[PDB]
Amino acid sequence: NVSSLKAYQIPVQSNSDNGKQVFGFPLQPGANNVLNRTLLGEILNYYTHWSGSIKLTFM
Amino acid sequence: QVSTQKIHYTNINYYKDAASNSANRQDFTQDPGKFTEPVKDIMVKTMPAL
Amino acid sequence: QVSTQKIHYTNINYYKDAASNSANRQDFTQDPGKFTEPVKDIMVKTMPAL
Amino acid sequence: VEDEYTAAGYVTCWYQTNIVVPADVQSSCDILCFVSACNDFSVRMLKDTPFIRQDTFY
Amino acid sequence: LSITTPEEMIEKAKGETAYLPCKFTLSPEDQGPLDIEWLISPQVIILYSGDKIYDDYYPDLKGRVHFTSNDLKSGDASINVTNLQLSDIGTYQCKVKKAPGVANKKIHLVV
Amino acid sequence: VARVADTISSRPTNSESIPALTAAETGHTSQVVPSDTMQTRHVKNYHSRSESSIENFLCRSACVYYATYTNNSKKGFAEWVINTRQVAQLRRKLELFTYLRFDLELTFVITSAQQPSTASSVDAPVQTHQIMYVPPGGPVPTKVKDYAWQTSTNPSVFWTEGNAPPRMSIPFISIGNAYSCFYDGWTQFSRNGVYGINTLNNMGTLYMRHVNEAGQGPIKSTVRIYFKPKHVKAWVPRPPRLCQYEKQKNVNFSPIGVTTSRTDIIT
Amino acid sequence: VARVADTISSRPTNSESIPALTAAETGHTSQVVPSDTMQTRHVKNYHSRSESSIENFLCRSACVYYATYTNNSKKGFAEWVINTRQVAQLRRKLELFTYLRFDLELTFVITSAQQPSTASSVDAPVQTHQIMYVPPGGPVPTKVKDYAWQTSTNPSVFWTEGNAPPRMSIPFISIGNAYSCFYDGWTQFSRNGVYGINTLNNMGTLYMRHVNEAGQGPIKSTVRIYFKPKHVKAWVPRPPRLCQYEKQKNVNFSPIGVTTSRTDIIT
Amino acid sequence: SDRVRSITLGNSTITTQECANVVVGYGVWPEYLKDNEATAEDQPTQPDVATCRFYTLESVQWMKNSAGWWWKLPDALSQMGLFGQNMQYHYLGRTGYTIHVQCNASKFHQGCLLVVCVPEAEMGCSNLNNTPEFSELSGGDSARMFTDTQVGESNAKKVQTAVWNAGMGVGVGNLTIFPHQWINLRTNNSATLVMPYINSVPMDNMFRHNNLTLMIIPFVPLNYSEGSSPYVPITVTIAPMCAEYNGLRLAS
Amino acid sequence: SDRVRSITLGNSTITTQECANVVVGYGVWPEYLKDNEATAEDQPTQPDVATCRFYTLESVQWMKNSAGWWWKLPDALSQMGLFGQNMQYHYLGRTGYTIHVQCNASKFHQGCLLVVCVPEAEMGCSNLNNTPEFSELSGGDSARMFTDTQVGESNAKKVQTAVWNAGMGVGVGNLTIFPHQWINLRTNNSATLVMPYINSVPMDNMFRHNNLTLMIIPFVPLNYSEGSSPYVPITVTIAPMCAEYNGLRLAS
């Protein structure tokens, strides 16, 4: 799903059992292979030390 | 001429142009209000967006 | 700017940082009262310690 | 950079309750996720990026 | 780079599987390409250069050695030595070289 | 001072003012602060965003182009049109914006190298180089032994070895009000010919040559050019270039996935 | 002025205030002055403790590391991670304290040496060296003829022979509030792996190379690096290292007696 | 008088009839974190009675041919009730201890101890290539001991426990520059220190960083005539003060 | 609007777009213990961020032929981190809960629930001579369920789980006198109650006295046409408030 627009769609379907995991990824906004090419990533990849908090809007 | 640093420091301009002065390095001003919230009606935080 | 030496001497800051100034060499202050006598109750010299 | 002394945790997302739907409606839905910084972000110690290479001039 | 134990003594019985581990972590100042070697002093026995394996180097040990993990770029250079024999006594050197760091591990195997 | 905002304390509330739920359709990014979804302590924050400004991000020299020219040869001399499209470590820093405006500070790091001479007892004195700058439209030299070099009123600099590298400053030389790092649209009213080419950013050429003569053995030199955008102001930011550059004129590329991949969505 | 205290006169007393006898169990060092156990004369004292302060004890340059790299070879270039653990005449001055905080002043003393060339009539011009500094995380070059050198926005310095040695200043670059010259405790939450290793003091690498080409005969160079801790403040003093160092990472040692010995307790 | 003290914390109390003064760190008294220095983005928790009390570690015997003992401080209380329980569910946390060691003897014994609390005590391995493993570097409220003989070389991951070097490669005599007290069975009976939070960051994890070390080194060895009690035990009781934590998570 | 709420506690948050108002106990808001009423002779401890947050119990499936569910309140959080940990080392302790149950459905289902929190719910056994044992009276954050059939008599230590008597021998309709809310899949989506500390002594042990009970009884059973989702789960998330404890001891 990388060489397409499917990389941004998170699969959510009507499960049968309760308490399943949808996704999960470590939070290293300059080294992880998920938050790397986002707009935050190519700003962090020019500096070395960062700080502050991060928001994560879902839709 | 004399200003503060990251105490004081002294700077003197020698040449008679403007593109010869050193870098500024001290234009600390930001205003994200034109990239974050570029909407017509003001959006309050607490009340819902609709 | 102008201060005394070990008469007077003149110093001028040129660059616009803080890690560019020369060494201080003139912070003469000591307080051994935190290594010699780190006890809770004051200890007088003459009277015995017990 | 990928270090171990300063890890920053993990992010997960679990089903609280199932995804229910009426009839004649697809049960396969999708979710998008954004990312940004709060108003107390900052950086330091400027360097160059490890992404763009070059062997000869263009 | 840093190996957890630069040298130790291992003892196994003839006819068993020999585990010669080689763990490491990555300091922040390491950003080059990865390289992992393995030596023997009774001569390379297996290489890992360019994310691909080249491991037909020692005729005495053909197929009798292969990496364990599937995440070799995470700090695993261990080898699975199978079917130990008597001509396999010698010191091993797990030489890993990631620019600009270097670290070794001296595994002296005795049987 | 450009200090960041501190965080204010909070108490566990139970009210109808929900700061978390919003509508991302409106193109309006969220504005919540952690003090609105959990209990926080009043932390004074002294961090500063100074080293992330524009003039702290761009005003750093970067090699642009470097050419070689032998001494013992006819027309041994280097020419170069002035453009930042050629090196990629600097090209990408200038594509983050669309309309830039800066004055420049060149710097040349000239080196020499003795060639395989053939005579005996070779010995040459110090060398002297000339770096001639031709505005767009001036007359261009054809060979080293030419009279467009001396008898000229263009800005040039004479430099000899063993000293500090030369450096000149160039003001904002353009026809519009900003350099355009992008220009969609043709350059002929009939909409033919080359696609992304603009006269707005042309700056002329650079001709360099030796000043000494051929004593006994050839000497190949080398000159490296360094930019330094000062007084810069940027407009209309832009996402960063992802696919690898292929040409210096256009923005051609080959398609490549968005990111490197992982084994499963939950790992 | 930091003057020492003078001594006041005394008279032969006979009282119940004994200043000599005290209790060393309380961990409280004595505080007597010779004017309390004998007759002394009022001596004005003009001695000064200025040349024993911290900034007079540390702010003196000391060689840290030096590498060599030949000209006529592929990938002839020197790399070095920045750490003070390697030289022992300076390592011991920094172990007297636990948490230091200083900004730095590097200095490079670059020299050259002509190698055993083989051709005839060898003659090379002045040389130019480049000393590139890569922050922790940046891209590292692989060979001399590489495009990570020029097209870069890292801080580097260009220097040519026969001039004053280069020098740059580096501010306090760390994640915490002080460099830690000691750190007891592992670096993985599972308590495995290396023991005394900390990200708090990392400073990057240093890549150096020639800028000229191979004219006719190889030239091996040599660069020496000198620190200079300024604005320093020290915390939590520490006894001085006794046993000889053995490694650059940990504090391993071999046990050795406390002092050199004498023939008898009364001599 | 001037010989008795009475220290109380939480719901425990320590009373000593014969003792010397109390040495208070580097001159500072342990307190909470001011908000000029705070770095966590959330609000910390403060039990303040459930943790701030006197836990008592295990006992040690002072034989005649003894060498020494050491405890790694924010690791020895790993199993002592609510302190160890809050040390697991959180991620950060700062403390300040009030160490108290007590060893009583009659008027017919002789001996002396050096009760020192060396901060950031990094120890060296027996083999110059390796580093000491975790099992042999500390123990849960248990006393690892020094030795009087140089540990051999063929050992892979062990600690060099030659006492005349304090294990850190430093001369054992110069250890008095750290806060310390002498247990002297002539006049002293108990030594007590009040150690604030000493570290280069305002808070830190507590499973990966033992930022203190309480050592006990018998300078003048124990000695007695025949007839007196041949068993003289030592017992140290440590008590956190002004503790607070951050960053809830799962157990670990 | 008037349909959305946003409840936050400690470091957790609950947000609901569609819900009804919140019912607050008997008109009082949970708070700490005043000193006119205190009876313990010592000082209590107050974590106040480590415990006051939203723990989430296990899920339950709402089948068509469902009967009901009940949880014993200060027993279901026995294994949820710092709350369960402080519930063991101490001896007394008072709390006040903020119960929240949530069950979402589309606009094509139908059903209703009664979310009631009966205080001091004493249950009756199946055999008239015995009393229900502990294993079958409650479960660690697990839902015991009612039934639609009268439990037989030959069972020795079981609970009478006939739903039309609520297990307490009382008529199931009259349960609305206790604080309650109706989960109605037509207009409602979530029910939330704020229950103070209701007991006849200022503090009490928490392993021997389950002084609340959260019951859920489907009056109008779930029903849907063919095609819609056949699995509708219910999830309750409970959060203590204003907790404090007394009387340290060993683990138990």
Per DSSP, G244 falls in state: P
Distance between first and last Cα of chain E: 30
I5-9 and H233-238: which strand pairing? unpaired
Across the interface, of G27, G32, G55, the residue whose CB is closest to C23 is G55
F102-F108-F109-F113 Cα dihedral, nearest 10 degrees: 150
Residues in chain D: 58
| Dist CA G37 CA G11 (whole Å) | 10
Sign of CA dihedral I227, I233, I234, I240: negative
Is the bond into E100 cis (omega within 30 degrees of 0)?
Answer: yes
Partner I, chain F 50-79, Cβ-Cβ below 8 Å: none
**Residue I82 Cα distances to F39, H38, I90, I213, I238, angstroms:** 17, 24, 12, 22, 14
Amino acid at H97: Y
Beta strands in chain G (DSSP E): 62-70, 97-105, 108-114, 128-134, 156-160, 169-170, 179-180, 205-210, 219-227, 230-237
- Residue H152's H or E segment, with its range, is none
G191 near H137, Cβ under 8 Å? Answer: no
Distance, CA of F262 to CA of I23 (rounded, Å): 47
Contact between C15 and B9 (Cβ < 8 Å): yes
Do D52 and F241 count as a contact with CB atoms less than 8 A apart? yes
Closest CA to G155 of G173, G170, G144: G170
Domain count, chain F: 1
Contacts of G51 (CB under 8 A, 6+ apart): none
Tokens 């302190």 belong to: H83
Nearest to F210 by CA among F71, F65, F67, F68: F71
DSSP helix/strand/coil, D33: strand
| CB contacts, 8 Å: E27 with chain D | 3
Q: Which chains form contacts with chain D, at 3 or more CB pairs under 8 Å?
A: A, E, F, G, I
Give residue H180's Cα distance to chain centre. 11
- Chain D residues touching E28 at Cβ < 8 A: 1, 3
> Cα F209–F111–G134 angle (5° rounding)?
135
Strands I94-102 and G128-134: unpaired
β-pairing, E7-11 with I69-72? unpaired
Q: Do chains B and A touch (3 or more CB pairs under 8 A)?
A: no
Contact (Cβ atoms closer than 8 angstroms) between residue G77 and residue G209? yes
Burial class from Cβ neighbours inside 10 Å (0-12, 13-18, 19+) for residue F85 reads buried
The four Cα atoms I5, I6, I9, I14 give a dihedral, to 10 degrees, of 90
C42 and H CB contact within 8 Å = no
User: What CATH number does the domain containing H19 carry?
Assistant: 2.60.120.20
Please tell me which residue of chain D has the smallest CA distance to E32: D50
Q: Where are the beta strands (DSSP E) in I103-221?
A: 112-117, 144-145, 180-184, 190-195, 213-217
Inter-helix orientation angle I81-89/H81-89, to 10°: 180
Number of helical H runs and strand E runs in chain D? 0, 4
* Among G65, G146, G190, G194, the residue to mutate for chain E (most E Cβ within 10 A): G194
With an 8 Å Cβ cutoff, is D56 touching chain F? no
Touching subunits of A (3+ CB pairs, under 8 Å) are D, F, G, I
Q: Is C44 on the interface with H (CB under 8 A)?
A: no
DSSP G85-113: SS-HHHHHHHHTEEEEEEEEE--EEEEEE
Residue G190 CB neighbours (<10 A): 10
E-assigned strands of chain F?
Answer: 14-15, 62-70, 97-105, 108-114, 128-134, 156-160, 169-170, 179-180, 205-210, 219-227, 230-237
- F7 CB near a chain H CB, below 8 Å? yes
How far is residue B43's CA from residue B46's CA, in Å, rounded to a whole number? 9
Which residue bears the tokens 């967006």?
A: B49
Local structure of G56: helix, strand or coil: helix
Nearest residue to G210 via CA among H170, H110, F222: F222
Which residues have a Cβ under 8 Å from the Cβ of G149 and sit 6 or more positions away? Answer: F63, G130, G132, G141, G209
Contacts of C34 in chain G (CB under 8 A): none
Residue H73's closest CA among H90, H87, H89? H87
Burial of F45 by CB count in 10 Å (0-12 exposed, 13-18 middle, 19+ buried)?
middle
Residues 6 or more apart whose CB falls under 8 angstroms from that of H28 comprise H196
Cα→Cα distances G1→C4, C28, H84, I97, Å: 11, 7, 51, 67
Dist CA I11 CA F36 (whole Å): 11
DSSP H30-50: -----TTT---SS--B--SSS
Radius of gyration of the CA atoms of chain D, in A = 21
Instruction: Count CB-CB contacts under 10 A for residue I145.
Output: 13
Query: Which residue's structure tokens are 């961090």?
Result: F47
Rounded to an integer, what distance in angstroms lies between the CA atom of residue G213 and that of residue G153?
Answer: 23
Q: Would you give the distance in Å from CA F248 to the centre of its chain? A: 13
Residue G55 corresponds to which tokens in the numbers above? Answer: 């900034």
G136 contact residues in A (CB cutoff 8 A): 48
Contact between chain D and chain E (3 or more Cβ pairs less than 8 Å apart): yes
Contacting residues for H41 by C-beta, under 8 A, at least 6 apart: A53, F7, F34, F40, F43
In a domain, I252, yes or no: no
With DSSP H G I counted as helix, E B as strand and the rest as coil, what are the percentages for chain A, rounded to 5? 15, 25, 60
Give the position of tokens 């030096």.
G66
The alpha carbon of G201 is separated from its chain's Cα centroid by a whole number of angstroms, namely: 13
Separation of alpha carbons I86 and A54, rounded Å = 33
CB contact under 8 A, D6 and G175: yes
Handedness of CA F12, F13, F14, F20 (dihedral sign): negative
**Dihedral in degrees, nearest 10, Cα atoms G69, G75, G77, G82:** -130
Residues of C in contact with B10 (CB under 8 A): 12-14
Three-state secondary-structure class, residue H174: helix
Helix (H, G, I), strand (E, B) or coil at H73: helix
Residue whose token pair is 């020098």:
G167
Residue H248 CA to residue H246 CA, distance in Å, equals 6
Q: Residue I251 domain-assigned?
A: no
Of the candidates F107, F106, F105, F113, the one whose C-alpha atom is nearest the C-alpha of residue F68 is: F113
DSSP run (H or E) holding C4? strand C2-4
Classify the phi-psi angles of C42: left when phi > 0, otherwise alpha if psi is within -120 to 50, otherwise beta: beta
I17 close to F (CB below 8 A) = yes
Among candidate residues E77, E90, E70, E12, the one with its CA nearest the CA of residue E48: E77
At G154 the three-state DSSP class reads: coil
* E78 vs E70: CA distance, rounded Å: 11
The domain containing residue H106 runs over which residues?
Answer: 5-246
Give the SS3 label for residue G62.
strand
Residue C34 DSSP one-character state: G
Residue E72 contacts D where some CB pair is shorter than 8 Å: no
Note whether A17 and A42 are within 8 A (CB).
no
Q: Which two tokens stand for residue I89?
A: 């080392």
Tell me how far apart the alpha carbons of residues H159 and F204 are, in angstroms, rounded to a whole number: 71
Instruction: Supply E58's token pair.
Output: 């020692």
Distance, CA of I37 to CA of I39 (rounded, Å): 7
Q: Read off the tokens for F159.
A: 């430099």
d(CA G7, CA G44): 7
To the nearest 5 percent, what fractions of chain C are helix, strand and coil? Answer: 5, 15, 80
> Mutating which of A49, A50, A51 best tests the G interface, going by the most G Cβ atoms within 10 A?
A49
Total length of chain I:
252
Tell me whether strands E106-110 and E7-11 are parallel, antiparallel or unpaired: parallel
Contact residues on chain D for I229, CB-CB shorter than 8 A = 18-21, 27
- How would you classify residue G72: left for phi > 0, otherwise alpha for psi between -120 and 50, otherwise beta? beta
Q: How far apart are CA F41 and CA F9, in angstroms?
A: 5
CB neighbour list of residue G266: distance below 8 Å, 6 or more residues apart: none
- Per-residue tokens: G37: 């156990």
Q: From the CA of A38, how many Å to the nearest CA of chain I?
A: 27
I164 backbone dihedrals φ, ψ, rounded to 5° = -65, 0
* Whole-number Å distance between alpha carbons of G175 and G196: 17
Alpha-carbon distances of C3 from C8, C11, C12, rounded to whole Å: 6, 8, 11
The one-letter code for the residue type at G40 is: T
Q: What is the dihedral sign for C-alpha G46, G47, G48, G49?
A: negative
**Chain C CB contacts of B12 below 8 Å:** none
Q: Is G204 in contact with G82 (CB distance < 8 Å)? A: yes
Interface contact flag, E29 G79, Cβ < 8 Å: no
Q: E22 to each of E6, E14, F170, F189, I197, how far by Cα in Å?
A: 9, 22, 57, 68, 59
Element housing I14 (H / E)? strand I12-16
> H128: which residues sit within 8 A by CB, 6+ positions away?
G246, G247, G252, G254
Q: I98-122 burial string, b = 16+ CB within 10 Å, else e?
A: bbbbbbbbbebbebbbbbbbbeebe
Question: In chain E, whose CA is at the least distance from the CA of G206?
Answer: E100
Please choose, from the candidates E18, E20, E22, E56, the residue with its C-alpha nearest in 3D space to the C-alpha of residue E36. Answer: E22
Tokens for G96, please give them.
């007297």
When scoring I4, I7, I8 by the number of chain F Cβ atoms within 10 A, the one with the most, hence best to mutate, is I8
Q: Is F15's CB within 8 Å of I22's CB?
A: no
Among C38, C43, C50, select the one facing H25 at the smallest CB separation. Answer: C38
Structure tokens at I204: 């009490």
Q: Which of H36, H33, H52 is nearest to H44 (CA)?
A: H33
Resolution (A): 3.8
Alpha helix (H) ranges present in chain D? none
Q: Does residue H150 form part of some domain?
A: yes
Residues from chain A contacting residue D52 (CB–CB below 8 Å): none
Q: Which of H89, H88, H123, H47 is nearest to H207 (CA)?
A: H88
Distances (CA, A) of H215 to G66, H83, I2: 40, 22, 65
CB neighbour list of residue C49: distance below 8 Å, 6 or more residues apart: C43, G22, G23, G26, G28
Retrieve residue G81's tokens: 């991670």
C50 contacts G23? CB cut-off 8 A: yes
Separation in Å, CA H25 to CA H57, H182, H187, I36: 21, 15, 23, 41
The experimental method behind these coordinates is cryo-EM
The answer to whether F18 contacts I5, with C-beta atoms less than 8 Å apart, is yes
- Continuous H helices in chain A: 41-44
Largest CA distance in chain C: 60
**I164: enclosing H helix or E strand:** none
Q: How far apart are CA G94 and CA I160, in angstroms?
A: 77
- Dist. CA H156–CA H126, nearest whole Å: 7
Cβ–Cβ gap F246/D46 under 8 Å = no
Q: Considering only the beta carbons, identify the residue of G17, G26, G53 that sits closest to C39.
A: G26
Q: CB distance G152–D53 less than 8 Å?
A: no
**Residues A32 and A25 sit within 8 Å (Cβ to Cβ):** yes
In chain I, DSSP finds a helix count (H) and a strand count (E) of 2, 12
SS3 H1: coil
- Which chain F positions have a beta carbon within 8 Å of G123's beta carbon? 114, 122-124
Going by C-alpha positions, the residue among F91, F84, F96, F82 that lies closest to residue F208 is: F82
Q: Are I151 and I158 in contact (CB under 8 A)?
A: yes
Q: D35 and A54 in contact (C-beta within 8 Å)? A: yes
Cβ separation H26–C41 shorter than 8 A: no
Alpha carbons F226 and G151: distance in angstroms, whole number? 9
**Domain total for chain H?**
1
How many Cβ contacts (< 8 angstroms) between chains A and G? 5
Q: For residues H125 and G254, what is the distance between their CA atoms, to the nearest angstrom?
A: 9
Asked whether I238 and I100 are in contact (CB, 8 A), the reply is: yes
Give I117 to chain F, closest Cα distance, Å. Answer: 20
- Assess contact for H67 and H159: CB atoms under 8 A: no
Chain H residues within 8 A of E8 when measuring between CB atoms: 130, 156-157
Give the alpha-carbon dihedral of F18, F21, F26, F29, to 10 degrees. Answer: 90
Give the whole-angstrom CA distance, residue H19 versus residue H22. 9
Q: Name residues whose C-beta falls within 8 Å of residue H31's C-beta, 6 or more positions apart in sequence.
A: H96, H242
Interface test with A, best of I231, I234, I236 (most A CBs within 10 A): I231
Q: How far is A45 from chain F (nearest CA, A)?
A: 11
CB I234, CB I58: distance < 8 Å: no
Strand, helix or coil for residue E53: strand
Residue of F55, F117, F129 to mutate when probing chain G, most G C-beta within 10 A:
F117
Where do we find the tokens 């653990």? Answer: G85
Is residue G162 within 8 A of residue G183, CB to CB? The reply is no
Q: Minimal CA–CA distance to H199: which of H210, H211, H191, H207?
A: H211
Q: Give chain B's largest Cα–Cα span.
A: 60
> Is H43 in CB contact (< 8 Å) with chain F?
yes
Q: Quick one: CA dihedral I129, I131, I135, I136, positive or negative?
A: positive
Question: Which chain D residues are closer than 8 Å to G137 by Cβ?
Answer: 1, 47, 50
Domain carrying residue G209: 1-267
Whether chain I lies against chain D with 3 or more Cβ pairs closer than 8 A is yes
With CB atoms and an 8 Å threshold, state whether F40 touches H41: yes
> How does DSSP classify residue I160?
-
| Cβ contact, residue pair H169, G186, below 8 Å | no
Q: Tell which residue, H122, H123, H115, H114, has the closest CA to residue H97.
A: H115
